[PDB]
């Protein structure tokens, strides 16, 4: 396969390794309880959280329903923090001060100790705003609760946002998707040629944005499948919550089932001419030269094209 | 309610009466020990077993690791057996010879005596393959074994590879076509009849589902299960019997701990789904539906139902 090195970034199971729509791919103890937390190795471009029946944006600091998901005021203020502020903050750290924008944001979020637990490996995720050059640390690592109903989504208002786990790798631009591939269709390398993906499901999509949106909706998810009828502390932890009104969430019921490990309907071929989004769940291993198509993934930016 | 007679086949507790994802709804003695075995009265369309970290397919005869779940070769060969071979085999039996292929495969499997036990009521289940018109008697009636322990690990699933298979207990009824679900209902949504109207099911759990097959898979996964929740440390002989195993390498499995109804669903579960084809959402619920709503955006499915076939 002449396509192996090129196609490496599209093996989402390998290179990302956790959920995309909902990333809760690891567990980490904070003060004696194991909490779920995002753990994917790639940035998720254009991902944010929509709070339903509300005008509050999710990057609004948590209420200390009026509030969002972001870190409340700390002293000194750790979040939000601009790119320049971050580089100045870490000036004495050779291995941190020069990391790319997104990786720096991830590492910065990763320096926030949870709940004065100095032993803990738990690290908060973050959102980077590329327009504002601002890093927002998320206090709430839950992504879907469908007190607050909400869901993850690509939305036109989120196009400059990137959702970042603690695990985002420093060379993500070499090894992860970002841009959509114009004039290219994902395929499978079989006996010296790029063949069509055998099984695809097709949907109407007015533009590339709408196709990327759909793929995202259907992509790898670490959200629980079985769960009680009412919200319970056990259900909250399974959704990625850690804190409730001034105490940690605990549950006698906590002892790997919910982890996708990157498995899902993560790829799409958008036919710009017929306005159909072609969605599949096997990793592609080549490209087909087809001028009618744009190749997208749930990780990819919903608009940007190369 | 004008829907009563029409909706009877969606009363899964009544018409099927056992687990769907894992069906172990009866016990039957073989050589002095009670074993668990499938007892559902309806066929389960598109159900097979996935063996983990293995190149072995579940319809391969048992190893006699390299093996599956199917009957080892017998003389005369009783399994696998084609429809035509079955009809010829039972040519002298008026009551069996002209049964529908599914009920026939169930009855054929039910004629295998377990472990030379002349008067046992234990009857092996079977899988009928509609593509090759072959009946496969299963020697292993276990359907799930994947505890954190050592995970020969396996689980039940609907999968594209299994779409022409039907998993058949010994109790599959001869008139299943009239009394059991099979086809999904296109342009229809399950509801509840309230005051001269078909109303929405009050509580549904909603999930993303790219197509009807995926919705049907999800419903099956959440459906009535007779599996022990008793996932514990090592796999003990008692645990094996609770999982539906009967044999282990030249002896019956036995246990002093076997008491002489707790893991039986009797068909109670998240057995139904309304799939919204326009929003790609699978809405799953655990109460029997009692009418249909005319909605072009939906397809009504059950855990029993074929994962593709529509009406
Ligand atoms: Cl029982």
DSSP string, A158-185: GTTEEEE-TT--TTHHHHS--SBEEEEE
With beta carbons under 8 A apart, name residues in chain A contacting B207.
225
Cβ distance of B210 and A265 shorter than 8 Å = yes
Structure tokens at A77: 């203020």
Q: Work out whether the CA dihedral A165, A169, A175, A178 comes out positive or negative.
A: positive
**Residue B188 forms beta bridges with which residues?**
B294
Residues 233-262 of B with CB under 8 A from A: none
Sequence-distant (≥ 6) Cβ neighbours of residue B260 within 8 angstroms: B34
Count of other CB atoms within 10 angstroms of residue B10:
24
Q: Which of A138, A144, A162 is nearest to A52 (CA)?
A: A144
DSSP per residue, B112-151: SPGGG-TT------EEEETTTTEEEEBS-----B--TTT-
Tokens for B249?
């390498």
> What's the angle, vertex CA B50, arms to CA B47 and CA B52, rounded to 5?
165
Rounded CA gap, B123 and B234, in Å? 28
Q: Which residue of A has its CA nearest to B231?
A: A255
A184-201 burial, b if ≥16 CB within 10 A, otherwise e? Answer: bbbbbbeeeebeebeebb
- Listed in sequence order, the residues at least 6 apart from B163 whose beta carbon sits closer than 8 Å to its beta carbon are B46, B213, B306, B307, B308
Strand order in the sheet with B81-82: B44-45, B165-168, B126-129, B134-137, B81-82
Residue A102 buriedness (CB in 10 A; 0-12 / 13-18 / 19+): buried
Q: Which residues pair with A276 in a beta bridge?
A: A204, A271
- Ligand 1 centroid–CA B262 distance in Å is 4
Domains and CATH numbers, chain B: 1-10+183-227+263-311 (3.50.4.10), 11-182 (no CATH), 228-262 (no CATH)
**CA neighbours closer than 13 Å in the CB half-sphere of residue B267:** 20
Phi/psi for A207 (5° steps) reads: -145, 180
Say if B232 is an interface residue toward chain A (CB within 8 Å): no
The answer to whether residues B239 and B230 touch, using CB atoms and an 8 Å cutoff, is yes
Q: Which two tokens stand for residue A23?
A: 């990333």
CA A75 to chain centre: 28
DSSP string, B213-271: HHHHHHHHHHS-B-S-S---SS--HHHHHHTT--B-SSSB---TTS---TT--TT-SS-
Interface of B with A in 124-163 (CB under 8 A): 148, 160
Do B208 and A221 make contact, defined as CB atoms within 8 angstroms? yes
Q: Report chain breaks in chain A, C–N > 2.5 Å, as residues after which they occur.
A: 64, 146, 255
Cβ contact A178:A304 at 8 Å: yes
Q: Is A279 on the interface with B (CB under 8 A)?
A: yes
Residue (of A231, A250, A246, A239) closest to A72 by Cα position: A246
Q: Which conformational region is residue A133 in: left (phi greater than 0), alpha (psi within -120 to 50 degrees), or beta?
A: left
Least CA distance to B269: which residue of chain A?
A226
Q: Give dist(CA A266, CA A69) in Å, integer.
A: 26
Cβ–Cβ contacts within 10 Å for residue A79, how many?
24
Breaks (C-N over 2.5 A) in chain B follow: 64, 151, 260
Reduce the DSSP state of residue B15 to 3 states and report it: helix
What's the gap in Å between B6 CA and the centre of ligand 1?
32
* Sequence-ordered alpha helix ranges (H) in A176-264: 208-218, 233-238
Cβ-contact B180, B43 below 8 angstroms: yes
């Amino acid at each position: 396969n002449p396509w192996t090195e090129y196609m490496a970034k599209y093996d989402i199971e390998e290179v990302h390794g956790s959920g995309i729509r909902v990333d809760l791919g690891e567990d980490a103890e904070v003060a004696g309880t194991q909490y779920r937390l995002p753990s994917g190795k790639c940035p998720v471009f254009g991902k944010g959280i929509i709070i339903e029946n509300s005008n509050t944006t999710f990057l609004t600091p948590v209420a200390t329903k009026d509030g969002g998901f972001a870190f409340p005021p700390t002293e000194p203020l750790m979040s939000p923090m601009t790119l320049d502020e971050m580089r100045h903050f870490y000036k004495d750290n050779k291995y941190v001060k020069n990391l790319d924008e997104l990786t720096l944001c991830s590492r910065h979020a990763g320096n926030m100790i949870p709940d004065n637990d100095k032993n803990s490996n738990y690290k908060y995720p973050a959102v980077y705003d590329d327009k504002d050059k601002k890093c927002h640390i998320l206090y709430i690592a839950a992504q879907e609760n469908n007190m607050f109903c909400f869901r993850p989504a690509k939305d036109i208002s989120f196009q400059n946002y990137t959702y970042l786990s603690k695990n985002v790798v420093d060379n993500w631009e070499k090894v992860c998707p970002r841009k959509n591939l114009q004039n290219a269709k994902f395929g499978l390398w079989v006996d010296g040629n790029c063949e069509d993906i055998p099984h695809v499901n097709e949907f109407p999509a007015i533009d590339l944005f709408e196709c990327n949106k759909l793929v995202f909706e259907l992509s790898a998810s670490d959200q629980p499948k079985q769960y009680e009828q009412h919200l319970t502390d056990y259900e909250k932890i399974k959704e990625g919550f850690k804190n409730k009104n001034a105490s940690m969430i605990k549950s006698a019921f906590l002892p790997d089932r919910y982890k996708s490990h990157g498995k899902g309907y993560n790829w799409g071929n958008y036919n710009t001419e017929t306005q159909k989004c072609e969605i599949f769940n096997v990793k592609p291993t080549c490209l087909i030269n087809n001028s009618s198509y744009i190749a997208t993934t749930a990780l990819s930016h919903p608009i940007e094209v190369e």
